[PDB]
Amino acid sequence: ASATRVIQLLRNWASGRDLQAKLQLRYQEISKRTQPPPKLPVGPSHKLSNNYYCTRDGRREAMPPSIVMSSQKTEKKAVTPAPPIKRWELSKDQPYL
Amino acid sequence: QLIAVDEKLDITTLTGVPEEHIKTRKVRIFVPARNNMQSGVNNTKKWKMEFDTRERWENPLMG
Amino acid sequence: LHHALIPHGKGGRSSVSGIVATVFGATGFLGRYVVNHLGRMGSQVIVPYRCEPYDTMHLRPMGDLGQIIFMEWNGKDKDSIRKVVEHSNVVINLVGREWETKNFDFEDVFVKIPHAIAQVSKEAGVEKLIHISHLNADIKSPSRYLRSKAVGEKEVRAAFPEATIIKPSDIFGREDRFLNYFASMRWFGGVPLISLGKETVKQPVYIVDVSKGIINAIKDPDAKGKTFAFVGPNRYLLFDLVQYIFAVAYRPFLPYPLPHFAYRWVGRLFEVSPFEPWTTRDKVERVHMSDMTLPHLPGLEDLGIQATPLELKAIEVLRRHRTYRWLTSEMEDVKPAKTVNI
Amino acid sequence: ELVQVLRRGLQQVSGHGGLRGYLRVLFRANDVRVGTLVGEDKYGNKYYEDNKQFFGRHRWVIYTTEMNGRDTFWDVDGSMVPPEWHRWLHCMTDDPPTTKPPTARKYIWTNHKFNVSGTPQQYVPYSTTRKKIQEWVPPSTPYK
Amino acid sequence: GVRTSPTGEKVTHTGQAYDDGDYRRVRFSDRQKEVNENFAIDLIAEQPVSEVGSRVISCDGGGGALGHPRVYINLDKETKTGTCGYCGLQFRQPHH
Amino acid sequence: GTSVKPIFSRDMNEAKRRVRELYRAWYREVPNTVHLFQLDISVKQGRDKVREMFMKNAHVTDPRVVDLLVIKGKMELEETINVWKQRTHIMRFFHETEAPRPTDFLSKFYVGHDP
Amino acid sequence: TRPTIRPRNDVVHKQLSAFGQYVAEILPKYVQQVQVSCFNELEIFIHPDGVIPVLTFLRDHTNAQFKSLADLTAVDVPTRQNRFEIVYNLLSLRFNSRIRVKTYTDELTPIESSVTVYKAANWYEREIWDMFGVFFANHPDLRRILTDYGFEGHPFRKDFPLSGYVELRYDDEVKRVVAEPVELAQEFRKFDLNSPWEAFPAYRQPPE
Amino acid sequence: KVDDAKVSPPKRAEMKTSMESLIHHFKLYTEGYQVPPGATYTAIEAPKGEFGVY
Amino acid sequence: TYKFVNMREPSMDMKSVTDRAAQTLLWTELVRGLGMTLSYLFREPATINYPFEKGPLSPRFRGEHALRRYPSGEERCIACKLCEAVCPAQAITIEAEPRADGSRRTTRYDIDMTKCIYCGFCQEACPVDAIVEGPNFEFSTETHEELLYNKEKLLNNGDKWEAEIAANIQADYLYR
Numbered sequence A: 001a002s003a004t005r006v007i008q009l010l011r012n013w014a015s016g017r018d019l020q021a022k023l024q025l026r027y028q029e030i031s032k033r034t035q036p037p038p039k040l041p042v043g044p045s046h047k048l049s050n051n052y053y054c055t056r057d058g059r060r061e062a063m064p065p066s067i068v069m070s071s072q073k074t075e076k077k078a079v080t081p082a083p084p085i086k087r088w089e090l091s092k093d094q095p096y097l
Numbered sequence B: 001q002l003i004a005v006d007e008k009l010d011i012t013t014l015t016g017v018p019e020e021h022i023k024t025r026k027v028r029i030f031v032p033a034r035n036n037m038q039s040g041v042n043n044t045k046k047w048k049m050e051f052d053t054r055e056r057w058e059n060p061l062m063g
Numbered sequence C: 001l002h003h004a005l006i007p008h009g010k011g012g013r014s015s016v017s018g019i020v021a022t023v024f025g026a027t028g029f030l031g032r033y034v035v036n037h038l039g040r041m042g043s044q045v046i047v048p049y050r051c052e053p054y055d056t057m058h059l060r061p062m063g064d065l066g067q068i069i070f071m072e073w074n075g076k077d078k079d080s081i082r083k084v085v086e087h088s089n090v091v092i093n094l095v096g097r098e099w100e101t102k103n104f105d106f107e108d109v110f111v112k113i114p115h116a117i118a119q120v121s122k123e124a125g126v127e128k129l130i131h132i133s134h135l136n137a138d139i140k141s142p143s144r145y146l147r148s149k150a151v152g153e154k155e156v157r158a159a160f161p162e163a164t165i166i167k168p169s170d171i172f173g174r175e176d177r178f179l180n181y182f183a184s185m186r187w188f189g190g191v192p193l194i195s196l197g198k199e200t201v202k203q204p205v206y207i208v209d210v211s212k213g214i215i216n217a218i219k220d221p222d223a224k225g226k227t228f229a230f231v232g233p234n235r236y237l238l239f240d241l242v243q244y245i246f247a248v249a250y251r252p253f254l255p256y257p258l259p260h261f262a263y264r265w266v267g268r269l270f271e272v273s274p275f276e277p278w279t280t281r282d283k284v285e286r287v288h289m290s291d292m293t294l295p296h297l298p299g300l301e302d303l304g305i306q307a308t309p310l311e312l313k314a315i316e317v318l319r320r321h322r323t324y325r326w327l328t329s330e331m332e333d334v335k336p337a338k339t340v341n342i
Numbered sequence D: 001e002l003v004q005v006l007r008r009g010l011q012q013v014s015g016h017g018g019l020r021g022y023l024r025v026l027f028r029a030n031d032v033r034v035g036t037l038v039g040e041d042k043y044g045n046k047y048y049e050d051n052k053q054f055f056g057r058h059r060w061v062i063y064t065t066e067m068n069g070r071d072t073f074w075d076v077d078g079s080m081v082p083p084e085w086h087r088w089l090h091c092m093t094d095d096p097p098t099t100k101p102p103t104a105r106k107y108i109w110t111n112h113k114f115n116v117s118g119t120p121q122q123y124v125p126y127s128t129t130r131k132k133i134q135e136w137v138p139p140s141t142p143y144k
Numbered sequence E: 001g002v003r004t005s006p007t008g009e010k011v012t013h014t015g016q017a018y019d020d021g022d023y024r025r026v027r028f029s030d031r032q033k034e035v036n037e038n039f040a041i042d043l044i045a046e047q048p049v050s051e052v053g054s055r056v057i058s059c060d061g062g063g064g065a066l067g068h069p070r071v072y073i074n075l076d077k078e079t080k081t082g083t084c085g086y087c088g089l090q091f092r093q094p095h096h
Numbered sequence F: 001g002t003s004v005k006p007i008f009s010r011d012m013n014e015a016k017r018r019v020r021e022l023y024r025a026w027y028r029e030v031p032n033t034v035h036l037f038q039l040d041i042s043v044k045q046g047r048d049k050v051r052e053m054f055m056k057n058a059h060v061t062d063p064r065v066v067d068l069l070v071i072k073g074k075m076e077l078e079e080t081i082n083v084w085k086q087r088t089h090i091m092r093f094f095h096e097t098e099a100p101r102p103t104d105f106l107s108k109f110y111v112g113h114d115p
Numbered sequence G: 001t002r003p004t005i006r007p008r009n010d011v012v013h014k015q016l017s018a019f020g021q022y023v024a025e026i027l028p029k030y031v032q033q034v035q036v037s038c039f040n041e042l043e044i045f046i047h048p049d050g051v052i053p054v055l056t057f058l059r060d061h062t063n064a065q066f067k068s069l070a071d072l073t074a075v076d077v078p079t080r081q082n083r084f085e086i087v088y089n090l091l092s093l094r095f096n097s098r099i100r101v102k103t104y105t106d107e108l109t110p111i112e113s114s115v116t117v118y119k120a121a122n123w124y125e126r127e128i129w130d131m132f133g134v135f136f137a138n139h140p141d142l143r144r145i146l147t148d149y150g151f152e153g154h155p156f157r158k159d160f161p162l163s164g165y166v167e168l169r170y171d172d173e174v175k176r177v178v179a180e181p182v183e184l185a186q187e188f189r190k191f192d193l194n195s196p197w198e199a200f201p202a203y204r205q206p207p208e
Numbered sequence H: 001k002v003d004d005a006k007v008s009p010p011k012r013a014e015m016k017t018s019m020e021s022l023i024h025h026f027k028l029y030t031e032g033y034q035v036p037p038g039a040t041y042t043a044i045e046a047p048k049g050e051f052g053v054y
Numbered sequence I: 001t002y003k004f005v006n007m008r009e010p011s012m013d014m015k016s017v018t019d020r021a022a023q024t025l026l027w028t029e030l031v032r033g034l035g036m037t038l039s040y041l042f043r044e045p046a047t048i049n050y051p052f053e054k055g056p057l058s059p060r061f062r063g064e065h066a067l068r069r070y071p072s073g074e075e076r077c078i079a080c081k082l083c084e085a086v087c088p089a090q091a092i093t094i095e096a097e098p099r100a101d102g103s104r105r106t107t108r109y110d111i112d113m114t115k116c117i118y119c120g121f122c123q124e125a126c127p128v129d130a131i132v133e134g135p136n137f138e139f140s141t142e143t144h145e146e147l148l149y150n151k152e153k154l155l156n157n158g159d160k161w162e163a164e165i166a167a168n169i170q171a172d173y174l175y176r
């Protein structure tokens, strides 16, 4: 910034950190307001040869839902909707805050 | 368990519609005709219900 | 009928009613009701204003988008009147000051301005002209108010032969001066009444009835040259009227007789206020004068309006004057006053 | 460390053209900073920059005291900047019109107008479409 | 290229103007009427006609991706100039 | 048969009994509504308005529809009692700012194309 | 098939089908149909009388625990005899799975309130009653929740008009806000956007 | 965006040179893309909790 | 992977107990908060001197609408009505007819700025860059009627702001 060094020291002592190292205000490290033009690549289906649309039609592969046990129409172990969720681990990075 | 009502179904008192738009309106039940500009027949499958056309005027500002 | 002036719609806010009105003096007590009733039907209202634009803000929500137009004018300038009525097919004149002012005496307000408006409206091709005068408008009257009213009514009839003239009698309403004036008198301890108000009969009329009468007179093809008298259903003695007014407000009534000279002197002293006066000698003369009875003129019943009795729409005006104790009192526990009906 | 601060203050006082200019800029812009003059406007606005300031305070304008028709010594508004200096001032680009002038067209306005709301030049909407139904005009010849 | 109605009111490019008796002119009193003075038809008529030595020419309005979709115009008709559907520019095949 | 199940009432008599209970409750509440909301109408006006709203759908002959109507009426009564409703909500039952639409043929013909 | 098409997951489809059959076998009295959509979502269609038993089983059973109720809404299809369709969306924290329960209703038949089963349902059922008019039998406090006081009609219904029947404005004569019949300055413009050509052949219906 | 012009609009540079691109841009911005019949409940972890749409 | 936020206990040694008692009796953390606030008291405020300074914007910013022209002067709009069909708020109203010279042009083009949501879909749908959302945002009016733009107002906006609209489109048309 442009503050006096004694005021800088007063700020650093009052806050407890070094405010000079980090500043909320932005002075000169941001990008320029004028930039060179981009090129913006095309994509995967921009081929000319092996690009028949019927082989990449996501909307046409959807089908009506599978009907199981229509009402109009031995072991048998009990089954669950999914395997039980596994217990979470305690954050080797910083377990207790 | 079962009351065995013997009355014609009528819910005009629960819908909150003013009687002006119940005793006077005239709905039209039909299958829409095919658009003659096109040959596709996918818009002539289901029955539709619509009301009679009422007055439309030109609003003085913006027309 | 000038196709752009053909009625359309269900008569609501966004409809077209074929009315292009220029309500002179629309920023007053009757003017707000007239503009509200015009804007309800979807009419186009041109409001000529001379006051601060802040004082016309209450009129903006009364019409749809673009249906209310505000223009500045001057009473003594003929070109402004020319500008504001150039495109209207009906002109309503509600200009009037109860108290005489330094720049606009009673002759200026009730004679010169109405005559100029009528002349310019006739010269501009305006089809209808509604003019408001007083029921007690007399040329021999002891009040300059009513003498000016009569002179201006004659001049308007002379300059606009097909003008409809309406003569209400002491309109009462929320902002009405008449109901409030009596309520306001409680502060001075007692209520000074000349001859105890025992020889003065009043026939006040509701404001909504007057506005509806004006609106129905605009839409009545056979009311061109007629003159109407808008009066209430019941006649009251002044003493009983003030007693009922104080009873509705739940205030102690302490009337006492005051001689005419003293009352006039008191009015004169008040008249010296540079602001709007509390009362004037003219108000003294008008408030202690019996309302004329004119059976030869049409009325509200001849326009389809059933006049609203005072006993139904008096609490809505006088509840504001109650204290906290009586603020929640109901309407039908007052035992209405006695009417000297015929 | 302090006398230098007071010297910068006095230099700011001197750099506006004496005490009268300092008071004018203090009472008109509520700020007495000094910066490099990027360019001067067709209507009288002057545009400055100071890259030592943080983003947002490194570009300002001193509005003219007389616009098209109205006195603007006190009542200034942000609608007076013309489009080129509007683009430069709002940090949409790094180049002023003095360096990168806009393309010229025969239809582009040669005189920018501010917000004309509340003045007799305000925009009044209307329908631009012609009549829909034409009516029948009766003949002027009597039929008997 | 603005005209003026008998009532002194400007006429727009569309051509709508209020009838002498139209009450809607009251909205312009003490105010103004918004009219654009750069009429498009006159401005496009002022442009010259391009002479090209091909029976088919293409137009994209100028500017590549900043113009209109590219279209091809046939110039085989001799007594008439090919007109772009989007831009309005005219082209002709050299004669005389 | 018809495999229909009731809401509250088995027959028409219970539905009627509930209608009368609701009518008593509204009749009792009207004066308190007039005092609390500081309305400008008399108690007779409120009570005959309540009667008119009750009679507006007196042609219903289905006990389920009658039960639903009573439920809605109790909802409105509860809103009135707890003061959730304002003066505007109560006065919306009276249509004080609407022009009276004509019902004869000639006036309808004069005004517009809507029957 | 690789870059733009969503990738199908086989394992979850089998798991959801197996659990659907499990629930179907446990509750044959109420469950009418079980479906598994191809984006791996499980649906169970039940009878209106089974709202409490099925939800209680799905919340309390050891194998399938659906303690949390995610959503509860209604869908309106006028062409059906039973107009409304009540949808319950549950979430199992133990097994990291979701299930959906569907039933049907008409204008007059009430449905049992599930407030005892789920605390969350108390507001959701109020909203269903407010917007669709479906009555819930044993609701502790059933009333309008989202609409205006003394608002007639139910807004989320196919028959109901988009702009309603009344509109509000302030009237200076009566000094309060008043409701009057709707009169729009500009009418909503209805667009006909459907294409006259069939898009997805997989959902073609028999022509009878 | 998904490189499927029947769901996402093509680039402005191709809409003005390619016929298929112009047709697809037109039909996407006037009618829109059809969605196969079905019902879903997708929920994300919004900052305020579980935000989902049915 | 999870972490606890309030699952720590304090040491009960006499030094730490005395430190906690001194904190309780002498308001140490309150003084720390005072110090932080005093520290911000001596910084440079982040306030810009509006209206003499404006906040940063981008070429993609959507402001007041405008109708552009070709370099020859012809209007770009061809009454294709795509912008009207895509408008989520139904704020655009368009009418058209053949011109005197046969061109496909509009006779009415209204945008209700009080219905508009400033989403920019209209300038995305337009195939000829006719309707754009210019960079202006300071166009407040004193009446509702002034915000109901017609074709003349939009054309005037285009004529007035073209010098900047063309530059903004040039700086971003490669991203579209």
Ligand SMILES: CCCCCCCCCCCCCCCCC[C@@H](O)O[C@H](CO[C@H](O)CCCCCCCCCCCCCCC)COP(=O)(O)OCC[N+](C)(C)C
Residues within 6 Å of the ligand: D027, D028, D029, D030, D074, D075, D076
């Ligand atoms: C009881 C003690 C008080 C007695 C009354 C006096 C009290 C003190 C009055 C102090 C007045 C100060 C206000 C005037 C400051 C002028 C500054 C200037 O800007 O005002 C201009 C207008 O000046 C006014 O005309 C001055 C009004 C005061 C006129 C004289 C008042 C005298 C009062 C005397 C009272 C008693 C009279 C005798 C009978 C009682 C308009 O400014 P504006 O455009 O916004 O500012 C632009 C802001 N920018 C920079 C962001 C653009």
Ligand SMILES: NC(=O)C1=CN([C@@H]2O[C@H](COP(=O)(O)OP(=O)(O)OC[C@H]3O[C@@H](n4cnc5c(N)ncnc54)[C@H](OP(=O)(O)O)[C@@H]3O)[C@@H](O)[C@H]2O)C=CC1
Residues within 6 Å of the ligand: C024, C025, C026, C027, C028, C029, C030, C031, C050, C051, C075, C093, C094, C095, C096, C097, C098, C104, C109, C132, C133, C134, C135, C167, C168, C169, C170, C171, C172, C177, C178
């Ligand atoms: N009120 C009553 O009890 C009765 C009224 N009347 C008549 O009804 C009409 C209005 O009644 P009311 O509205 O209650 O009275 P108001 O004083 O309330 O209406 C006053 C109106 O007249 C305008 N006005 C007054 N003097 C002038 C002037 N010199 N130049 C221009 N405009 C002026 C005012 O404009 P501003 O306020 O901006 O100056 C205001 O709009 C009057 O003619 C009155 O005589 C008839 C019988 C009884």
Ligand code: SF4
Residues within 6 Å of the ligand: I083, I086, I087, I088, I089, I090, I091, I092, I111, I115, I116, I117, I118, I119, I120, I121, I122, I123
């Ligand atoms: S920005 Fe969006 S809402 Fe506004 S006019 Fe364009 S498409 Fe319509």
Ligand code: SF4
Residues within 6 Å of the ligand: I076, I077, I078, I079, I080, I081, I082, I083, I084, I094, I125, I126, I127, I128, I129, I130, I131
């Ligand atoms: S502005 Fe563009 S999208 Fe809208 S009608 Fe004109 S050409 Fe079509």
Ligand SMILES: [Zn+2]
Residues within 6 Å of the ligand: E059, E060, E061, E068, E084, E085, E086, E087, E088, E089
């Ligand atoms: Zn071209």
